[PDB]
Subunit: 276 residues, 4 copies
């Protein structure tokens, strides 16, 4: 199966499909072990995690592709990737973004209508450029829109329907925080709708049964693991500096034997034995 076919199958056999943010290759394998069928590379996470920078469009296609290659080299779970507005203003930038994502093994990407949003026709043109560049039809193009917040619910439906007509496979409406609105949105746009359930934001922490009842097809936890990983890491640095040892924070650590297990150290031994 192509990465994109895997993503489509995940969406078809889980309702709603849970998609978790994976900050690096290691966390992709943890996500697979935990039983998730799809994973996500947050653009905010590439910026804040990989580059230690704010999510202010400093991160480029190269930064994101590095993380895609590292994750898809070891993890076979379909990866949804945040590509912002396509990494440049031209249809040719959007095409290079699409073709590079497919080549480096990403299963899906979401592209947004940020410039404030562009006009419905500019967003349709962005989607047409991505659909036209696609060398593998199974690769999923998800249209992300901030139209609800800027122009209202009917504006967001009309824009999403125009994106679907242009070839968008799935819709990511931003700032949608009422289950009734998700349900009305899903009935109108017909294709799979993603609910972004991030923490410390506008949205209620809706559950999978709640989202399924509102006919939502995917639910995204874009930075959840990362936020816990930073608190845990900061506790270790503070403890080492204060105590002059890590001994008082040993209880918060993955063991050496857990790590060997989670990167499948044994399968490497097994490979050499089978070969020689």
């Amino acid at each position: 199966l192509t990465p994109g076919q895997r993503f489509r199958e995940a969406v078809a056999t889980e309702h709603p499909l849970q998609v978790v943010g994976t900050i690096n290759a290691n966390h992709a394998l943890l996500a697979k072990r935990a039983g998730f069928k799809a994973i996500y590379l947050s653009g905010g996470g590439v910026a804040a995690g990989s580059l230690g920078l704010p999510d202010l469009g400093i991160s480029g296609l190269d930064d994101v592709l590095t993380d895609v290659r590292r994750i898809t080299d070891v993890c076979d779970l379909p990866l949804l990737v945040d590509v912002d507005t396509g990494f440049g203003s031209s249809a040719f930038n959007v095409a290079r973004t699409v073709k590079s994502m497919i080549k480096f093994g990403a299963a899906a990407m979401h592209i947004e209508d940020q410039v404030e949003i562009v006009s419905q026709q500019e967003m349709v043109d962005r989607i047409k450029a991505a659909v036209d560049a696609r060398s593998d039809d199974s690769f999923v193009i998800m249209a992300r829109t901030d139209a609800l917040a800027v122009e209202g619910l009917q504006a967001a439906i009309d824009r999403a329907c125009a994106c679907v007509e242009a070839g968008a496979d799935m819709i990511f409406p931003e700032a949608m925080t009422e289950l009734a609105m998700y349900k009305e949105f899903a009935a109108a746009v017909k294709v799979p709708v993603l609910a972004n359930i991030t923490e410390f934001g506008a949205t209620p922490l809706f559950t999978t049964d709640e989202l399924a009842s509102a006919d939502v097809s995917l639910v995204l936890y874009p930075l959840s693991a990362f936020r816990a990983m930073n608190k845990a890491a900061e506790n270790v640095y503070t403890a080492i500096r204060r105590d002059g040892t890590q001994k008082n924070v040993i209880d918060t650590m993955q063991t050496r034997m857990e790590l060997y297990d989670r990167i499948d150290y044994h399968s490497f031994e097994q490979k050499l034995d089978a070969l020689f």
Copy 2:
């Protein structure tokens, strides 16, 4: 000050100098906020964290330099980098490693005598190659040796002294589990000695006071933060998969407002206002 100058000064103004592993640029900034004067890029961390791979020499110079550039682009703490045996068998491979580490902003590297170890003359020739390629004399070349485990303490002192005569600035003896052995090693070798205080290994979790009494000049916590980060992330994946929400692991998460503070989001707005 060159990164190398900062590393030398850190060792001169802290006894022993605490050097913490930083798996990514984000955690480099966390370590700086916690008050550490020096940080580390573990080669086992690039493998296990960045590539999701065992530490079996699959990770190469390019994988490591990508992590070096990401960290030194945003964090000004001197970075000590694990370069295995120099990423190739030639003096020219060791030379390209050295020059690339200096160019991409690393302050120090450690290079080891792994092939079982190489002859004392082979290790000396590796040090000479690295020392000859150094375009900036302040960049620290740290000789790492498994000679105590293979040939006993007197061999380990002889080899280390031979590395210092070849131009090695500092010494990283592997698997030293008695403060008395450190104390003796330090007086015999004369140059700064690093103690590798990793978890779940042979070494006791010695304190800064203990190591200062044994004349140890640097103490390394290579993966401490990483191991806590992975347990925290696995907890979040488990909870989300079990509960159909992240509701029950919110209390383990760095807040949005903390993330913004730790990647200094507000100095970006400040530069904008200060510039235009």
Copy 3:
């Protein structure tokens, strides 16, 4: 819809012998396609000497080669045969990472050699086994390169090649074969496609496609030919500009702006924008 390896196998099946030309960069891959070639090559000595300005002494790594592979295959659909030295590391895992990366970054084929003086037939077979096992797309071609002829003689080179074929090598690249009759004996014995490396200024005669076909050779490689001419031409420009204080005396040696626009298909970009918008 063919994979790069299917394109490579199909080129070998439809041209006898198949001319494979070294392409130092994406621009020259496009020149080779326009000249009518069905396959191109990424020389390791060309990554070293051209892309890095370095001698071919194993300083160039997987990352360096992959960058050129990605630049070429992103714009040129011709199957790319790639020199991967000994696999960029001593471990079966290094060989596996090289094979998977070459497939992912769009190479059609790779050649891996028995250089450490050669390693034992067992070690070379182990290298091929590691490469064949790592292959995620069976259509990707693994070519075994061997210097056994010069080190151990013809029968040794034949035995090593057949062992490589038994380990799953698809095609064989013998080094230092200087006699046409030796290629014919070697091709009859090993059975799979044989590549003749017709580089310049080396031991090999400049054998023609007719001569190689008569010796049953399946591929003929011109690994650095365009690069060599490209460097003389460029040096003649630098010299002329430094000496004369102008490029006047080298204008006639240049590709025109209109030729370059044609060779990179500039106007097919404007047509795409019209087609779509």
Copy 4:
């Protein structure tokens, strides 16, 4: 111990006008150094057309340019002037990452232009400020490139360039200037070093270093000259190989193996091994 930027400023101070030659790759950087040039150039059109096989339509990005900067500056110590188009993104932060990345990867200087038609004088001044503020090494040269002459006329060009200088621009690259008398007037008004772009097959005449010295021009750029000769030579080889079934008829166009070993100083690697061991 000179920084790249200091070497560039030293080259401009010691040669009038300073010849700056385009170098498509690290190999050609070493040829330019052998020919006696004191400064070299990474064309953004050359990264697109040569490294990527693409037209110069803003598809090439910071990563593509940095790879070529690193490859060249790793082996060639001549100061490299880099085309960074409009800074690779519309934010002052994009401009800042471009400046810091170019300094870290070993570039001596960059030109950044007022393309969006051009932006307003204030928006170009804001580009230069963003770049000047981001500079961690003040020896690194910021060159303002402007198409104001063609769009708004010479006085507009001078005022824009003077406002770029007040914002901290070290040097000026005026686009589409084709009269020696105009270079002289422009140079007199702006005061800082002015670069003449003497590309081929364009609107500019092939002005010589003496003519440009007489018009007070401080730098002369030959941005793609060597690349254009390299492409014609490489196409001649491909054409000959396809037509003849052999390279025999184009051997005389080729750099020899002995010349290639000389130009990448193969000897100095053997000498280094001897010295160390």
